Symmetry: none
Subunit: 140 residues, 2 copies
């Protein structure tokens, strides 16, 4: 009953029951809406704040791990570069070792050639020796 | 006119104007609060949404960059491993070549020994052949 607030007993009693009831309900309804709008909004406000607080933590986490990762890239690039030069040096040693092997295999190949040709020369002397020796026997 | 919604034309005309004015003031005021509360919520929500969409973008951007860093980090970390194996493989190759060359020097040392020994035999055959040749001429 909000009507006794606005009007006076004399004025209010001059209103038919239907008129008061129509009025009472309408005031109640708009009053219900006021409490309704406040309830809805307040619950919304809580939701908005809670969601902002949580997406903030998600950013905090996203920021820190990007940071920890960025340093790690740098860590690799440094290590990458050091061993990259270390590899070149080893490659240099390897290529020098190959040329030595190539020189030695070539040397050995030549030394076999000289051996074989010497054996050929040696054989010629052997058969020549036989012929002289045998021919000598005729005159003994 | 907030009063007209509630009552019909006949009803309203049996009311003294003062009664209507008092009713109007109360009705207007409650309606003013309603429109006021809705204005509040609607402006609040817009602010709430804009604050979210802006921090949402900062999370989105930070994530996309975190992705690019992870991808770039992994790309490097694998390469680190890759050339790390190249060192191991090459270090083994070098160790194999060093062992091979050392074996070859020994081989060459041997071949020279075999060579000199061949030249020795060859000289002997030369002297022997000369000796037989002379001996033949003596007896012919």
């Amino acid at each position: 009953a909000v009507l006794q607030q606005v009007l006076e007993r004399t004025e209010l009693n001059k209103l038919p029951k239907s008129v008061q009831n129509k009025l009472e309900k309408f005031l109640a309804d708009q009053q219900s809406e006021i409490d309704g709008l406040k309830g809805r909004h307040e619950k919304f406000k809580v939701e908005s704040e809670q969601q902002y607080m949580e997406i903030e933590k998600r950013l905090s986490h996203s920021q820190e791990r990007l940071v920890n990762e960025t340093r790690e890239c740098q860590s690799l690039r440094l290590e990458l570069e050091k061993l990259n030069n270390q590899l070149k040096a080893l490659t240099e040693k390897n290529k020098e070792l190959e040329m030595a092997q190539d020189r030695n295999i070539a040397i050995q190949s030549q030394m076999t050639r000289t051996k074989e040709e010497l054996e050929a020369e040696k054989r010629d002397l052997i058969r020549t020796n036989e012929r002289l020796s045998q021919e000598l026997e005729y005159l003994t």
